[PDB]
Every structure is written in C-alpha cells, then in structure tokens.
C-alpha cells in the first residue's frame, strides 16, 4: 500500500526566437545536446496567477540547492529568453501548468543554501512588441478587421467567436502594439480578449460556453464556497446590463487542466449552479506547503454560446 | 589588545540656500554658533542606496533617545533644508558616506523610547527646480550644448566625456527642468548622466574607466559572488549592442570610498575579471545589525575610456 | 481584468485624460464679434456612458 504523494517536473529549453509564423513553445524544449535539463526531486515553491485580460499570465518559482552546471547554463543566456515548461500532479500523471519565457533570474547563496529565483511570462515578448499599421473604410465588415489583427499578433487561435454580419460605421486606423488595439475593440463591442498558455481566446462578455468540470467533496474540494465580489470597486448602474457584476470563490487541489475562460459546475450542499471562471492561482510547496488551486467564479446572464 | 569595533559621526549644519554658483554642502556644516551638532555614541540605524540615473540618491536614518535640545533645533527649520553629513568606518578613520538635505523629519515618543526619523536627498533641490530655456540651430557642435546645460544645473563637474566633433543634425529647443532634458539626451547618444554626492558624472554606456578596488577574502568580502540580472525585465534583441545587459553581485564590509560609476576588480576563486559598478546600498546597525555594503556589478563590452 | 497591478494604472491614466489634456475639437460658431474678430464655439462631440450619463462640452 502506498500514500498519495505529489510529483512534478520542470524543463528548460532553447532561447525563444520570434519569426514569421505562430510561436509554439513546445518545439523549443529540446536543447542543442538533445534532452533538456529536467529537475524533479528538489524542493520547489511556485506561484502562478492567470486571468482574462490584456496582461500576460505570470508565475514565480524558487529552487533550492541547484547544481553548479545548471546555474552556469543560466548565467549564460541572460540576454536571451529561455523556454520553460512546468508539470504537476499526483504520482501517476502530470498536467501542463505553465509555459512561457524566463523574464528574470537571480541567485543568492548566503552560507548554507542557494536559492534561485524566476519570473516567467506567458507570451510576454509577443504581446509587447507586435506592431501593426492597418486602416479600413466605411462599410468594411467588422469580422474581417478582427481576423486581420489577430494574424498580426502571431499566436495560435485558441477560440474565437466571429461578429457575424457586423460592419464598421466609421473609418478606422490602428497602429502601435496590436494587443493594445484589440483590447480597445473589446470595450466597444462587448468582447473579451486574452492570451493564455500561448492560445488566443476571443469571447463575448456575459455569455458562457457544457459542464467541463464538476466540483464536489469527491472532487477534492477544500472548504465551502463563499461569495466574493469580482472587482475591488462598484460601478454606477441605471437602477450593457449583460456584463458580469457578480461572482463567487472556490478552492481545490491542484489541477492544471483548467483555464480562465472555461466553465464549471458547482455541486455543493448550499450553492448549486453553473459559473464562468475569471481568475486562477496555482500554489505549491513540494516538501512543505499547499498543493491547491483557487478559482474566482463569475455569474453569467447571457446566451449559451 | 583591542577588538575591531565600529565608529561613526553625524553632523547637522545650516539651511542650504541655492544661489548663482555651484552648491557645496561642505561650507554649510558650521552653525551660527560655530561647531555643529555632532552625534557619536547613540544607537543608529541607516540605509543609503545609490545609483546612476536621473533620480537622486536617498538615504534613511534613525536615532534613539536624542536630547531635547537637538530635537528642538529640528522642530524649527522644518520649513528649511538643513545640510547633513554622515561618516563611518572602523575605530581609526571615517569615510564620507552621504551628504545632502533633510527632506523629511518626524518624531514618535511612545512611553519608553523616542525614535527620530530622517529622509535625505542627494541634491534633490537642484535636480527638481533648475529650469532652463535654450535653443540651437542646425550645425551647432553637440559638445557646446552639453556644457551649456550642465552649467545651468549649478553643480560641480565630477567627470565628463566630451563628444568630440559631433554636430547637431536638427534644430533643438530645451525647457523645463534641466535634469530632464539632459536625461533625454542620454538615450539618443549612448551616455549616462547621474548626480551623486554633489558631483555630476557624465560617461558613456558600455565603456569603463584601472583597478581602483580589488575584492578578495583579505578585502573583507562576505560570501561568494553570485550572478544576478541587472534589470527586472528582458529586452528584445536582434539575435546598440554595446549596452550593458549582464551583471553580477557582491557584498563587502562597509566602505564609503566607492561610487556607482567606478570600476572594481573581482579576485575570487571562481569568478575573476573586471566589472563596472551600477548600484550601491549601505546598511548599518551600530549596537546590533550589519555594517556591510552591497554592490551590483555590470559586465562591460566597450572601449577602455 | 482588475487583478494585475498594471491594469489599475491603465484605467487611472485612461480616466485622467478624460477630464484633462484637451488638445483639439470641432465646433460650430454661435456668437460672432466683428470688432477684434472672435467667435463663440459650441463643441459637437459627446459620449454616453453605460450608466446613463452624458458628457457635454460647455460654450467657449
């Protein structure tokens, strides 16, 4: 008989180079020598937050007592963006939990124990340097503008909801970073745009997608759900009506197969119903600490897209 | 036989008044009575950070159980900028470690012990109020523009590297604070501008000045050097190339005879070579605490100016 | 959405420009002075927020 013990894996690959086609962090895993630097049995502490907004998802990691060779490989490439993947689970499988580029790295080795630090960004390089220069005339179909701008961003299309037969009412011009322009089109058309684990997600506010996840005491829930406001401020109201404005909170054992834009079903004894996801935070302490995930849910009032 | 014990001195002088010539904090030390208020044998905690950037270097100080007369002298002059100097060393000498103006001061005396607080700025008054209004035509030598703007700033010239026979390509106009205009000229010409302990330093990025300091176990080093990135973010690269982009970290016993723009030689058993300095932080606890200095080094790839 | 530290500054800057930083605008003349030529301008543009509130430029 065994116990139920945690497991994880961390991989470091070649520098990421942006080209003239969508970037996939998967293909950069292999190093010039072939197999990548894998780190399994070392105490690790990490925190990974995810959201549906302009900003990329960022995660922090700490590793104790790394071998000198690995640290040397990171002393080099300090000018470059190494690709990194993280996996976690329970002794039988490990689900992808983050993938991005090493934004920052530093080492402090006071006496007894060295402590390496990381800051990782989910597509930070693309979202902050992809320039654009486009224009359109009166009568252009809005569905064409959306596709044109996304292709400029150079990322795979996770999911998109086209506008239909919508047409521009006035001439438009777009410059600067493509991400910023798209985030502005979100406000005026009730659409949510956010990149996550390399995938572009374009959806409509208020509406939601089946029960892709069910939460219950069998599903490793942790404590009862509690109602928490989804924003730190309140807006004036007429009392688009379809927009968000309500939510709840839940916690569960670590499970990387969840994304901010997904949908979940809450099977508890007090609260029951369907909710959207709005925010994720993954925490982990291998030898000591939690191994759980926190979800911020938001009520929905739109059509079932 | 003795031990190796710490010593320090703190001096407070007359209010600083800016005039029509370079400001020297040295000449304001003497008070109307003559000798200044010197504080030697009182527990003191201080933190002084220094850098090479637009912002002035600021340091914090705390003193316990001050006499009522001294506190009274600071209750007055609360509208004025008193000059302050700080010294530290080891029982045989004390090196100047900071000099500036008292930006802030507050007193809290709950029951047993009063605790005075200070915030000091290195040339804050000059850098934030020196206005300018200048213009030049096509063909003007850039070396003339630089000297004209610095004289406006009203500070002694610590060190400057002239541009040679460079000439303006387009007409230029400068207004507002002189410091801001100079900091903009830095970006477009690969030069570093930063005031420190009253001295103006204008140098060129990438290049460095002899071994003015050597670090080794004999030189009171504290722990091994570790590689730390010199910035909290990574820039996109073509992979001016001469710019910085790499660095290291070291710690040493308190030594005020060091400046951000200097050069140091690192004689350790793993790392060996020459580095620039980029950042300093001086910490101190007289009765209890550290008495060390931390240096952030940056690799160089330019000519040996 | 509103969790990141940068989004807060983004919204704060966006709102700050709304009440200041006026540069150019179209308008229509409503009052004309022929001695020392000057004109009174009524800006035409406006916006309506989702909260049923409107922003009108005053006569200049």
């Amino acid at each position: 008989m065994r116990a139920m013990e945690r497991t994880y894996t961390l991989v470091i690959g070649r520098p990421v180079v942006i080209g003239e086609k969508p970037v996939n962090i998967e293909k950069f895993a292999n190093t010039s020598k072939g197999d990548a630097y894998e780190i399994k049995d070392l105490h690790i502490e990490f925190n990974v937050k995810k959201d549906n907004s302009k900003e990329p998802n960022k995660g922090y990691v700490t590793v104790y007592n790394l071998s000198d060779e690995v640290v040397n490989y990171l002393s080099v490439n300090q000018r470059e963006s190494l690709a990194v993947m993280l996996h976690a689970g329970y002794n039988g499988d490990e689900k992808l939990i983050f993938s991005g580029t090493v934004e920052y790295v530093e080492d402090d080795f006071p006496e007894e124990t060295r402590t390496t630090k990381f800051i990782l960004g989910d597509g930070t390089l693309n979202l902050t340097t992809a320039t654009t220069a486009r224009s359109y005339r009166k009568g252009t179909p809005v569905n064409s503008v959306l596709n044109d701008l996304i292709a400029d961003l150079k990322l795979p299309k996770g999911r998109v909801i086209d506008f239909g037969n919508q047409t521009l009412q006035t001439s438009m011009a777009f410059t600067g970073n493509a991400s910023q322009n798209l985030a502005n089109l979100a406000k005026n058309t009730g659409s949510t745009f956010s990149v996550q684990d390399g995938a572009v997600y374009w959806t409509k506010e208020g509406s939601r997608f089946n029960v892709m996840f069910e939460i219950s005491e069998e599903g490793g829930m942790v404590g009862t759900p509690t109602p928490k406001q989804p924003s730190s401020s309140k807006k004036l109201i007429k009392a688009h009506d379809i927009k968000e404005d309500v939510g709840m909170t839940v916690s569960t054992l670590l499970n990387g197969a969840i994304l901010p834009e997904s949908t979940v079903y809450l099977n508890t004894r007090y609260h029951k119903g369907f909710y959207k996801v709005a925010e994720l935070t993954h925490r982990g302490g291998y030898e000591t600490g939690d191994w759980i995930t926190e979800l911020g849910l938001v009520e929905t009032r739109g059509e079932l897209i | 036989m003795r031990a190796m014990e710490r010593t320090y001195t703190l001096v407070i002088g007359r209010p600083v008044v800016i005039g029509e010539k370079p400001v020297n904090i040295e000449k304001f030390a003497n008070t109307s009575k003559g000798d200044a208020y010197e504080i030697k044998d009182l527990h003191i905690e201080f933190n002084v950070k220094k850098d090479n950037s637009k912002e002035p270097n600021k340091g914090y100080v705390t003193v316990y159980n001050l006499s009522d007369e001294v506190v009274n002298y600071l209750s007055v002059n609360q509208r004025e900028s008193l000059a302050v100097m700080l010294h530290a060393g080891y029982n045989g000498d004390e090196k100047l470690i900071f000099s500036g103006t008292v930006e802030y001061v507050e007193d809290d005396f709950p029951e047993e012990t009063r605790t005075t607080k200070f915030i000091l700025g290195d040339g804050t008054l000059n850098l934030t109020t020196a206005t300018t209004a200048r213009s030049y035509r096509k063909g003007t030598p850039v070396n003339s523009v630089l000297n004209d703007l610095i004289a406006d700033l009203k500070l002694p010239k610590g060190r400057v590297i002239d541009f040679g026979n460079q000439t303006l390509q387009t007409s230029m106009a400068f207004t507002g604070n002189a410091s801001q205009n100079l900091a903009n000229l830095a970006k477009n010409t690969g030069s570093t501008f930063s005031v420190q302990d009253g001295a103006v330093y204008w140098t060129k990025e990438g290049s460095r000045f002899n071994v003015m300091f050597e670090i080794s176990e004999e030189g009171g080093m504290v722990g091994t050097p570790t590689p730390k990135q010199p910035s909290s973010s990574k820039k996109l690269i073509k992979a001016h190339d001469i710019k910085e982009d790499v660095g290291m970290t070291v710690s040493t016993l308190l030594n005020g005879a060091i400046l951000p723009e200097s050069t140091v030689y690192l004689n350790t058993r793993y790392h060996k070579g020459f580095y620039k300095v980029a950042e300093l932080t001086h910490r101190g606890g007289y009765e209890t605490g550290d008495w060390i200095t931390e240096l952030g080094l940056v690799e160089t790839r330019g000519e040996l100016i | 959405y509103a969790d990141r530290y940068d989004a807060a500054f983004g919204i704060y800057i966006s709102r700050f420009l709304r009440n200041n930083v006026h540069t150019n605008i179209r308008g229509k003349v409503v009052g004309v002075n022929y001695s020392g030529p000057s004109v009174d301008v009524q800006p035409m543009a406006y916006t309506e927020f989702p909260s049923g509130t409107t922003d009108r430029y005053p006569v200049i």
């Binding site: 902050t128 | 910035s231 909290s232 820039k235 | 530290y5």
Partner: peptide
C-alpha cells in the same frame, strides 16, 4: 525579526517593478 519582513516587502516591490517595466523595444 524585521529582517524577515523586509525581505518579503522587497520581493513584493520587485514584482511590482517587473509588472510596470516589461517587454518593449526601447
């Protein structure tokens, strides 16, 4: 013990600086 607290405050300041300054060609 203030040593422990200063470290956490420093790390939070570092995270905020990273959030403000990231990516970009300049």
């Amino acid at each position: 013990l203030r040593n422990m607290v200063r470290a956490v405050v420093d790390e939070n300041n570092q995270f905020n600086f990273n959030m403000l300054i990231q990516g970009g060609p300049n």
